[PDB]
């Protein structure tokens, strides 16, 4: 494979002025200071940038880059995007299931994975966890090899690497680059961007491209840059790294000075002559969804801390609540305690559903990388991640809370009431989680999303029906009560609980009211709060939640679909 | 100044095995891999480590290190501990006020500062802000020079630097080290720890100390390490950095192998012979408190975002509350709304007082560095930081909330009630803030402290007196209500508000109760909640808060006094 770029000029303001070159099978490095187009040219060559600002032409074996390019070309990110909770084998299996063709057999996929593991030298760690915060894992030198394998699964002909050594140690980096050279000798074109290498690394390059401030200061074989700069009016003393020597020149031991010098250099003429010589989904929806769900559930189980903790907190809180409110009485204090406990349950569901902000925020970069690479669609990823994480870990706390507190407190002893309470808690949890996803989808920082969620839930709680009577609010403001999830949940719980209750011992208020200001039945309390006594007055609330869910889960999707992938 | 260390062996497990050497006026560098005692020997020489594990002897001009050592010796940290909100002049003024003697005149201090600024070359930025998130500031290359000036204020004879170039760019680092050499030529002993330098840096060193895995692989002039390793059985090729060459040897291109080789080397014999040749508060409390307070208040004003935001939120929330609860009525719904609004106010104060976790956590490292260096005592720092940040920014929100909502709602129209409400809000805010400080003092991560605060406040809210009646709780649990700040605040507010109110129109319940289950007066509501009607029953709550404050503000102090400074 030969990748030739001619008269590239990318503008966002401009970052690359005018760049020409070719890259043949072997080791091709792109060096320079951080400001220069060291990392931008790599994205441009890799089709990971918006073609809108691109000007020049990129060609492969004489043909332009097809739309099938990013699928046949591997790109390794600087930082890790491997699932630290899986194993070195599981990550490769997931990559192979979505990057390879379905025509193949699982045996063929396993053979490909075995060959890749053997080539990389991961045989002894093939079944060990890559590692996370809670989980002890492999060293940072083999995570990189796992990431490289995830791209070699498809056996591409061109391999792009963004700073493969940054973060690693010297002895690790040397081994990594020796491995890369061994790969390149097989007939692969490796193109990478390094940051201030050492000479033990510089001695391995087969081609060098030096960029500074968007200008090409040199392009050619890496072994002749020393001679070029020696003959250009500079001298390097002994025991000085040539890679450090180049950046020392660039800093000043002017940009247009070096640019013009190279444009008048012989290498520029050779590159221009060579460039003028030539020019002159994969899988089904169900498969993607199944595999995404499997990976997400493996990650959920393999991180027992942050999921078991929620269950433990739920159980403890439920027991405390059942102890404090034990034995609700049908007396003057029954109304207060019933309303208070239901209010606390509802608001606690809403506030505990703030952790959903972490769902699509922690794994944003991985999602973008895998979508660009053609793993799956947005729909399948979204549905699978909902089906694996949100659904089971939001359905369970409600069941636990209800099963624990319902009989300790001594609420309405009917089966239908029990299950209605359970279902209402479930719905309020789902609605709050969906709202959190909608607010936090596409972002990358948890803090602002969490703060906004907290503020919105605080105002919702104000408009729930305990702190303020909803029939006393002014007309020009009351409508806001229809934007409150807690209101619907609390209303449904009250309707289910208070209907056939008496709260004035010795007095038959159900028949008649002796005194007008007594509040001796649940119906009176409900009507005084503005609640409808018909069965619709219950189920209404539920539908109002369901619609919310739908709406929010739609917005989130549209915030992922229209999200900038470049 | 000549610093000689003999037979140093520090144990925590051991980190340094056996180290000998001397450091004379000039540039003395300590190189090696990260695992080695590169940074530990620097702390040991600088007396910034616990002498408990130390074994050998450290000497200065033949005399051991006095207790007055760290005050006469400068230590520059790797990362910045300069106040990004002040100016380059203000930081030096603060350093000079506490590190210099009070006998001097402000004119003399200003002259010293001017001389330091001139020597460093900060004349053109002497009155520009160093820079924070919100504030644009100076480049990273001059923050380091400001930090160096903060230590040169006292004009020490020995200057320690921990990785002065890590984080900086090449051109910045070269200038920094040239500045250090220019300083050293005046007659100062500079001792620093570098991480993999470049040859343009290595050519400046006057003495080198190579450590790996707690072993001394070489000590002597930096210009002869090349010859030593050449004659020791190794060869360096051209265009290879000697500093990279040494670490390449250490990694393996064994630890005891090199250790023994050096122990049998000539340099070890010379060092041992030389070592056997020789051996064989500043200011008043009020001044410290005043200056700490001034700096903290300057930082508070110079960060208007996170302080103005709280005021804006307070005003907005107060207006919303006054609009929702506008015109409280003396009818069936007056009790509910009054209780709800008071409950919301109290819990909002408690939950908004969570930001105090940031007080002593953000500036932990600066506090430790300045305490070790002899700036001030713990008492003065603690009191000043309380007096500058907590007091004014917790006193104001209560005043705003009260002044806004009291008359929109239409609460008890008396002056004493107004001021009692204000004072109660203030006290609850202070108590919650003190609890947060006690929980978060000495830590370094905000997340766990915030979570613990939230949980504690949730349980406190449960035991406040609205969600559950406190007279219905079982005896083996009711006592917990005495650990609730919101309970005391809410009780005081209720007592102040409900006393002389009627809530049943057309009915004179104050005289007699026609029906037993009516709740037509505030006294009945209060007694039904378990509240005492005597004036003590009000002020009691306040004292219960005051004690809390004291206790918490004591615990925090003891968590700073017994905090590990090393």
């Amino acid at each position, epitope marked *: 494979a030969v990748l030739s770029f001619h008269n590239i000029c990318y503008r966002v303001k401009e970052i690359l002025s005018n760049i020409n070159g070719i890259m043949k099978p072997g080791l091709n490095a792109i060096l320079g200071p951080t400001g220069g187009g060291k990392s931008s040219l790599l994205d441009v060559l890799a089709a990971r940038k918006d073609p809108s600002g691109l000007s020049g032409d990129v060609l492969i074996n004489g043909a332009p880059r097809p739309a099938n390019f990013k699928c046949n070309s591997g790109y390794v990110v600087q930082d890790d995007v491997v699932m630290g909770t899986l194993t070195v084998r599981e990550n490769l299996q997931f990559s192979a299931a979505l990057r390879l063709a379905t025509t193949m057999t699982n045996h063929e996929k396993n053979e490909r994975i075995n060959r890749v593991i053997q080539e990389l030298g991961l045989d002894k760690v093939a079944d060990s966890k890559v590692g996370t915060q809670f989980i002890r894992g492999v060293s940072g030198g083999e995570r990189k090899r796992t990431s490289i394998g995830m791209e070699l699964i498809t056996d591409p002909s061109i391999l792009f690497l963004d700073e493969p050594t940054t973060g690693l140690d010297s002895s690790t980096a040397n081994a990594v680059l020796l491995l890369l050279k061994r790969m390149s000798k097989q007939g692969r074109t490796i193109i990478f961007s390094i940051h201030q290498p050492r000479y033990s690394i510089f001695k391995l390059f087969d081609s060098l491209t030096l960029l500074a401030s968007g200008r090409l200061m040199f392009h050619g074989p890496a072994q002749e840059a020393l001679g070029y700069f020696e003959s250009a009016g500079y001298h390097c003393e002994a025991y000085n790294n040539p890679a450090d020597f180049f950046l020392d020149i660039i800093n000043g031991d002017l940009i247009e000075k070096l640019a013009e010098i190279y444009v008048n250099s012989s290498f520029y003429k050779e590159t221009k002559a060579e460039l003028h010589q030539l020019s002159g989904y994969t899988t089904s929806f169900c498969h993607q969804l199944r595999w995404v769900s499997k990976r997400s559930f493996k990650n959920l189980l393999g991180n027992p801390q942050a999921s078991i903790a929620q269950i433990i907190v739920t159980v403890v809180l439920g027991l405390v609540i059942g102890a404090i409110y034990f034995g609700l009485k*049908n*007396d003057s204090t029954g109304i207060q305690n019933r309303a208070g406990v239901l209010f606390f349950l509802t608001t606690n569901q809403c506030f505990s559903s703030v952790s959903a902000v972490e769902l699509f925020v922690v794994e944003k970069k991985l999602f973008i990388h895998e979508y660009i690479s053609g793993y799956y669609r947005v729909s399948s990823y979204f549905l699978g991640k909902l089906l694996s994480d949100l659904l089971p870990m939001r359905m369970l706390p409600s069941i636990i809370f209800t099963c624990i507190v319902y009989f300790m407190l001594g609420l309405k002893p009917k089966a239908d009431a029990f299950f209605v309470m359970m279902f209402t808690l479930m719905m309020v949890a789902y609605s709050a989680s969906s709202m959190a996803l909608a607010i936090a989808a596409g972002q990358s920082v948890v803090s602002v999303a969490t703060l906004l969620m907290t503020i919105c839930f605080v105002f919702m709680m104000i408009f729930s029906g305990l702190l303020v009577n909803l029939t006393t609010i002014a007309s020009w403001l009351s409508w806001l009560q229809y934007f409150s999830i807690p209101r619907y949940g609390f209303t449904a719980l009250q309707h289910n609980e208070f209907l056939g209750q*008496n709260f*004035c*011992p*010795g*007095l*038959n208020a159900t028949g008649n009211n*002796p*005194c007008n200001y007594a509040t001796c039945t649940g119906e009176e309390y409900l009507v005084k709060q503005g609640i409808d006594l018909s069965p619709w007055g219950l189920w209404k609330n539920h539908v109002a939640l369901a619609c919310m869910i739908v709406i929010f889960l739609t917005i989130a999707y549209l915030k992922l679909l229209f999200l900038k992938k470049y | 100044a000549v610093l000689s260390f003999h037979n140093i062996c520090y144990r925590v497990k051991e980190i340094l095995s056996n180290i000998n050497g001397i450091m004379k006026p000039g540039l003395n560098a300590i190189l090696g891999p990260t695992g080695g005692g590169k940074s530990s020997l620097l702390d040991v020489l600088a007396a910034r480590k616990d002498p408990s594990g130390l074994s050998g002897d450290v000497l200065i001009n033949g005399a051991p290190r006095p207790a007055n050592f760290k005050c006469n010796s400068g230590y520059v940290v790797q990362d910045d501990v300069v106040m990004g909100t002040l100016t380059v002049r203000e930081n030096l003024q603060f350093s000079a006020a506490l590190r210099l003697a009070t006998t001097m005149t402000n004119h003399e201090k200003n002259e010293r500062i001017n001389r330091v600024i001139q020597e460093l070359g900060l004349d053109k930025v002497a009155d520009s802000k160093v820079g924070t998130q919100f504030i644009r500031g100076v480049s990273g290359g001059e923050r380091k020079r400001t930090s160096i000036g903060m230590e040169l204020i006292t004009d020490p004879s020995i200057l320690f630097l921990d990785e002065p170039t890590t984080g900086l760019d090449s051109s910045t680092a070269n200038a920094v080290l040239l500045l250090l050499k220019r300083m050293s030529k005046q007659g100062r002993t500079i001792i620093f720890s570098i991480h993999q330098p470049r040859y343009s840096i290595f050519k400046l060193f006057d003495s080198l100390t190579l450590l790996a895995s707690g072993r001394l692989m070489f000590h002597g002039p930096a210009q002869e390490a090349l010859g030593y390793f050449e004659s020791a059985g190794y060869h360096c090729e051209a265009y290879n950095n000697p500093a990279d060459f040494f670490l390449d040897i250490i990694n393996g291109d064994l630890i005891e192998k090199l250790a023994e080789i050096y122990v049998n080397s000539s340099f070890y014999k010379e060092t041992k012979a030389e070592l056997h040749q020789l051996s064989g508060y500043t200011t008043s409390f009020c001044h410290q408190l005043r200056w700490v307070s001034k700096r903290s208040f300057k930082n508070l004003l110079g960060n208007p975002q996170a302080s103005i935001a709280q005021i804006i939120v307070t005003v907005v929330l107060g207006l919303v509350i006054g609009a929702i609860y506008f015109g409280l009525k003396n009818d069936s719904t007056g009790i509910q709304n009054r209780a709800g609004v008071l409950f919301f106010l109290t819990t909002n104060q408690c939950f908004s007082s969570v930001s105090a976790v940031e007080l002593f956590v953000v500036e932990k490292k600066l506090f430790i560095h300045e305490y070790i260096s002899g700036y001030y005592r713990v008492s003065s720092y603690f009191l000043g930081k309380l007096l500058s940040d907590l007091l004014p920014m917790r006193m104001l929100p209560s005043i705003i909330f009260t002044c806004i909502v009291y008359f929109m709602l239409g609460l008890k129209p008396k002056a004493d009630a107004f001021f009692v409400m204000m004072f109660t809000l203030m006290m609850v805010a202070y108590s919650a803030s003190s609890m947060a400080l006690a929980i978060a003092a000495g830590q370094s991560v905000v997340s766990v402290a915030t979570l613990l605060m939230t949980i504690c406040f949730v349980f406190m809210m449960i035991f406040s007196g609205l969600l559950v009646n406190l007279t219905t709780i079982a005896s083996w649990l009711s006592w917990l209500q005495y650990f609730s700040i919101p309970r005391y605040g809410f009780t005081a507010l209720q007592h102040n508000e409900f006393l002389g109110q009627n809530f049943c129109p057309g009915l004179n319940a104050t005289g*007699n*109760n026609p*029906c*037993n*289950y009516a709740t037509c007066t505030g*006294e*009945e509501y209060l*007694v039904k909640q378990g509240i005492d*009607l005597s004036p003590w029953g009000l002020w009691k709550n306040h004292v219960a808060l005051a004690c809390m404050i004291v206790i918490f503000l004591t615990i925090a102090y003891l968590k700073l006094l017994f905090l590990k400074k090393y």
Partner: antibody
Amino acid sequence: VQLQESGPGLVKPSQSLSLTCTVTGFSITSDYAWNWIRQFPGKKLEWMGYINFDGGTTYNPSLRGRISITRDTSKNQFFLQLRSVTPEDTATYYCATFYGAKGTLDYWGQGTSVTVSS
Amino acid sequence: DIVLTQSPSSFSVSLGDRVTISCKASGYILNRLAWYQQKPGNAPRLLISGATSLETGFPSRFSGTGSGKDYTLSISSLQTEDVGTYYCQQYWSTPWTFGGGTKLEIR
């Protein structure tokens, strides 16, 4: 509105005590609450508990698990069962009525004496 | 709970005289105070409710006055049909409690 007690006037220790109150002039499932009170020798009144018109019941905490109050609407009666009796709870027992809107014990029975001996 | 205390466990008066009985509570009662009269050989009979109201069937010689924790029953110009035992009851909290009782005598 017209209450009448009945039951054994003598009981063995730690066995049981059962009294019955019959109501005439009113239906016990309609409006009021129905209480049991006892008066010790050396006159001292003690409220034991009640059963409400809807079947709910409430008991004095000083009688922990020893007392149960039941009813039979078929013939308008309510019963008091005090178990694990001791010679200290020898007293005169009354059944009484509680309106609730007024708060006071308006109607009382004639009272029956109970002696716990052996 | 709430314990009601009657200080004069016994009294001694003569016809036409005025007598006063006091009940003191350990907690606020809010006029949920009742007074019962008991003769020897009969069940208690309600005499006063609400601490001020008088029950139909009794003369306008008994009066009730109180507030907070202190309440009093005044019998002015007592007769011979007024001798007996008098009990104060509170019906504020569910464990209703009676007083110890005050017995009237005749000199």
